[PDB]
């Protein structure tokens, strides 16, 4: 059985969404995924009765829709013709900029930091030494942001493009909270283990920002996660060690000024030294009145609002899905 | 037991006693020194602690 | 549990006194057809109303009556109960004091203030009750005590009027000579010196004056003596002694009562949503002994003002 | 994987692997027992093997069904008269573990699911919960709480531990 | 007698509508309005009637008007059955609903007694917590396993009593069985619970609630956050929970002194006052030539400035943006990625003791879809939804919530510093996502947010330190500050002409003589002017969109110098705010294809807005 | 339900919904009925020349002081004209006073006497309160076993006088509620029970004590009170009562105070106990004082010189302050109009504070 509610986008003005029950059957099992639309061919019924007794004289019968044809409102791999046309690109030399030229044509400049994002999700090899140690197969990214930048659009492009990309927000906007804990479910009342998003994003890339507004609870978690790639717990009668092979990409916020002083970045930032050490690449954005850049940007804004050579994006996501494995 | 600081993501380090929410029973919740009895304790950042 | 049915003598501390409400004993029933009065005696916790009639004349006849009860003809009884905590002096070295239920009926009601020291004598009877349904081993008897006589230690003032046998000893105190200097020597004499200090505390024991102008304000006839100094004077030797001799004396500390503790509180009532009071609620018309006012809460200072 | 357990897998030999949440407190079933008819003074004995609701005490004193004349010549033990003489009976264990799917892959959109366990005699007191183990099982169904909806369960045969 | 009298009521009412309808001449309608009522209903076939109470008060001189208005519950079938014969006389499945309007007398919840049951009384109030659409049976087909299992029958009333005693099957009176769930005629209904008006509540008393059900046609006419007038009729629902109330409890112990004998299935009753209705109006060409006069002029921009708050005497730019907050943007579509929002947000922090609340009271006092709150005692979930549950068997009924119900309206909230951080994220969800996400102990849900928010906070020390920046004065986080468009710092001085002008203006308000100081427009032709202005939809078709860029560049070239006193990371949103501000200016001008003069006025407007900030 | 003859009588501007009602059904009267013979006796006391001094002395015979301050308590009861416009307006007759100073002043003994007079008096204190502790007392019912919303403290203060002690020791959120009432005279409830604003009018009066137990001189008066001074200046009139080192009234002290205690009986002044009780009630409805042209020349002339002090401040509250105090004095002595005189002592009551502010 599946709950369904009214579409929040096309509400007539002032009114409220309501619910209805939908019952699945044999070949109709598990077509959807929560948070989507659906197009169903429903027959309209109600339940028969439950336990008529002394109540109000008004008969209260809840109505149930059974549906026949579940459809999406108006999954990706390689093929033989897709693995031989694959080799037509990979033989070339100038594929380096062309990847960056197909990354994000919205944000105009900033060639280095677009290249670093292109390198980070593209993956590494851990190459575990036999018996001794594995160093790392992950890329640790720091990006000191600035208000007055489209830095959220970069990580927005990541979650659309990548295979396993989970945006774990800074503070309380998502259901995740980056710390595993034994919780019950109000839908179901039993205790269920709920790992963090870093538990979730193993062999995936997580996107966490506003590090300054993160607690010491979060700060010990990020410290342990980049340390030995494994999270241990000591809850009620349970002691396990779950693994985590994430890759961390940041989006920070400068303290006070947009760029504080001649003082260095560790003096500019309000974070600590060991998380700075475990971060490898450090992307810095700039906010300055540059005469050529403002004419480009403002006319790009108006062109975006009068609306009132790169690889097409299906192929490059087919590229990295096939390559990284 | 490897520990970075006193704090893991959900695991304490010292002898914590948590009451059982069912039956209201006292038991030993956990930590580190009870676990690694007769063994090795690894603690990072003793002064950042 | 072998003293059941005997007549006993216990003592302790009156704690969590309930309210007085009438207990129905027997119910009258007007026939309205045969004209008799039916009577039903109830000794259980709950009961039921009965059938349409149980007369001898409504009986052996086709049309029986249909009855209803009456209020003014029934017999009621004064009912109130409380709990007694252990005396906390004969308790073994590692134990926590228990309690005991005592039912009170009739004339002796409205005679037991909470937080006192009293000798209760009575007879020891069980009540039909067991605990949880699955824990019943088959014959579980829950006991109580019925009150019969009250003898209080620390006899309360403003409750006597007899003077003859009283002045049989009072006049010998009066004719003893130099009485006022003898008094402050007698209250807690177990320290050395501080006679003028004891003399003012003798006057704190008096208080006892009042005046209202009428359609106006009262004046409080209360004395508020503070003590400063440390530490080898042993002030707490007198602080325990004052609330001990004085009736309605509650000994209090600094942190052990918070800003909500010594004032009232609201909890769900047992068998009989009342306002459960604190120590200053308890120790009215009496003297509160207070330790370490310097370490109170700042909100706790506001109540004292 | 635990994600796909269709109705075609009902009561078939299906194995899986996951993470054990937490055990239960050990109760006890009975296998062998001697009874008595509280009127007829009639004693028999009952053994069971597949204890995994199945059987209960009968409702006749059963001395009436007898191939002897003088005993059947000599009333009603009825109703159900049988009281178990507990002093000479035999008992077993029952465990009720609980397992959760491994959260490394695909619980992204949903909440994680779980099932309900039950182990037999020597399988009890075996596994500390939390480890990664594999269990061959029987996907069985019980009834208890109008569309005749029945909750899933696993009859458990042969857990092996991690090395 | 009563079989005759209600039938005499039936026939005289049958006489009434079949007569002439309206006295009026050929100038107007002549005759046969109620006769045209069915004939126009014959065109559309919606199977109800709209009949007047006032025409019924004309003919019988109130003798029949004082016959119906007392016991309407007595008069259900007689009013319906005779009208059914009127239909088949004139017209050809047919099911009816009878609606009234024009009640002369309207009362409140406090003017309702148990003697008023069956009678007609109109009650207005405040609609809160609507519920879903659910059916109602009123047509049982329920008979036993004996042959005649075809009893289309009773329980049309408010009782689940299906089987009649005397059939002529093999079944007896004790024989009863389930209803046939396929052969009946139903109707649907919803269940709203109205709250009492705040303009009628006495001292020491909270507003009161009452349940009401709208059956059949009157479903979906309701609106949470609305004032409405009702059908006069009233019913009573049996209650349960009024036990140990205390009181002498009535019982139903039947007689035993009848049939001679040779147990006790008796019951009690304890009900509650409910309400029922069938007509809900929601109250609460010639001026079009006047609106032509309101648009052909030119000074009306300057006229609309002074015609806002005559009680307030002083500056005017705060009256500009509130007026621009009253005028919507374009909110048009875009490409498939992200749609553009179409709203404006003005957030003012000022000195205590400045009469900023006169602005606050005026906004909620005039504009539609207006919500005022100085919410500190309010929860964070007060502006969010409440998961009310168990009004029935699985109600899950979502409330309105204090934020959403100002849809296309101004919801003004005061004292941001007095509120905590969780609201500020939930505000920032409303200011960025424009939606509301819900996972509250069970049912997950999503909601929306299309409102405009006006703010009123205070400085930390209460006053402005001019050597300090504005950013050291909000005491809140950055993106909720960065989302905000206009700021409007106000601080006052003494000036001996104006100090007398402040003295003259306030005392002349307390002069109840000559308090009729004149704005150039009245309040309601202004409110009419808002409605005509909403249908303009400006498309900028001017080459000066490129001239706007270097105009925006010279807003930044001087901001390229002097980052000392309240510097700003000069934002695309600030340039985007220049768009939406220049929108509603031309909306006041009745001008599409926006001129650069409309740009330049909006250009200097945000210029001196930050000159109020730059110190 | 009707008013006692002893204590005060409620206003008619609040009951007027049920004065519009209750004609349909014969009920109780709810109003202290004025008889006939004492009406000329009211007009007899109204012709007294020394009424402006006799009445304040006759209020509280226990303390022999604060004759301007007791007059404000008297003028608190003759408070203002409830002016509502055709649309909007709603200008009440409230005046709100804080008084402060040294202890041993029997400031509480003043307020208890004030608390007895008020027909809907609410006497609060400090630090036993909360933000929830004044409104929306939503809780569980017992016998019907429901969730019932209760009216709060200011709704219990709706009509009458609220009383607050130790005002300096409130929180930020407590005392933040006071901003809405002192400005708008409303309360905005918007949480899960009710989302609907409501008004609750009262006469707010409170008191506190300074940091030093004695206010020392050579120190600003604005310094030694822990209020934000725009919120401190928001009040209508603020008093300071200090101790003086003189001797002449101190011989008058103990002769007065022993006489209240000596010869255990309540006993050269005429002290009408119950004339003033009906004098205030009769003057409440039959008087709507009008503030016409002749006062406006002097009043605007007076306010600019008050504004002229610059470099505590004087704000637009002080302009509204005088007109609500002047016609309140015109509500005394049966004047439905204003006069150019009686305005000067309305200034002087503010100047009574000001001449105490020299140091």
Author numbering:
A (entry chain 2): 387 to 460, 473 to 706, 756 to 772
B (entry chain 5): 437 to 485
C (entry chain 7): 232 to 503, 506 to 538
D (entry chain 5): 147 to 198, 203 to 224, 234 to 304, 320 to 337
E (entry chain 6): 103 to 194, 260 to 429, 442 to 463, 510 to 840
F (entry chain 4): 468 to 734, 739 to 782, 791 to 838
Give verbatim lines from the article.
Replisomes in all cellular systems contain a helicase that unwinds DNA, providing the template for chromosome duplication. In eukaryotes, helicase recruitment at replication origins and DNA melting are temporally separated. To address these questions, we have started to analyze the reconstituted DNA replication system with purified yeast proteins by single-particle cryo-electron microscopy (EM). We report here the structure of the DNA-loaded MCM double hexamer before and after DDK phosphorylation.
To establish whether DNA maintains its double-helical nature through the MCM dimerization interface, we selected all particles contributing to the ATPase-subtracted MCM–DNA class averages and reverted back to the original images, to reconstruct a full MCM–DNA structure. This approach yielded a resolution of 6.9 Å for the unmodified and 7.5 Å resolution for the phosphorylated MCM structure, showing continuous DNA density that runs through the central pore of the entire MCM double hexamer. DNA becomes bent by 10° as it enters the dimerization domain and maintains its double helical nature throughout the MCM channel. The observation that each MCM in the double hexamer binds both DNA filaments likely serves as a measure to prevent directional translocation before DNA replication initiation. Conversely, Mcm6–2 is found in an open configuration, which likely favors nucleotide release.
